[PDB]
Amino acid sequence: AGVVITDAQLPDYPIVYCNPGFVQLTGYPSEEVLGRNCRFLQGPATNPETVARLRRAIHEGRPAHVLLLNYRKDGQPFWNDLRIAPVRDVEGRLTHFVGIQSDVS
């Protein structure tokens, strides 16, 4: 599965890490992912109601679990079984979010 960790302090929530699984899934190299928001995987047939629900959860700092349509680098679509979860530190401060993508096409 793809595993990404976005910095939840800077605005826009950039990716600061992606495993090899996420590079095989989407087809993007680690150098074209780091620093960008994971919304680049969306496209013309991505359901906006699923995305809106996902952006509310991220903005409220709560976990999420959705099924939205994404698009590899080659432009081929795939069902993405995304699962978001908020990470906090020792003194109770949101620092990161962990995402877990799984292809269920």
Added chain:
Amino acid sequence: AGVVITDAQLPDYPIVYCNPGFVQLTGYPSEEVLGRNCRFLQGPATNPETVARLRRAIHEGRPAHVLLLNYRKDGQPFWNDLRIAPVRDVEGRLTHFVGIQSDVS
């Protein structure tokens, strides 16, 4: 795959998060994982040289990728394809580690 996030500030490196995939893999519920170190998955046939190499990387704050034998709750063994990676914050401070377990038995 199993995904865990250990707090890298407190000593011992406790688990502060584990996805459902990690609960299906190991067979331990989320309530018996949180607060413990992921070394509870080791057993009598776990190669100590692989574990020592893993503890050096964690202590040096560097990524790792090993293949050690673990044990589910039921006592059944499995090849664990572990992949460790260090997480840092905005002002360059190690806060967490992300682990990715995959069964390759």
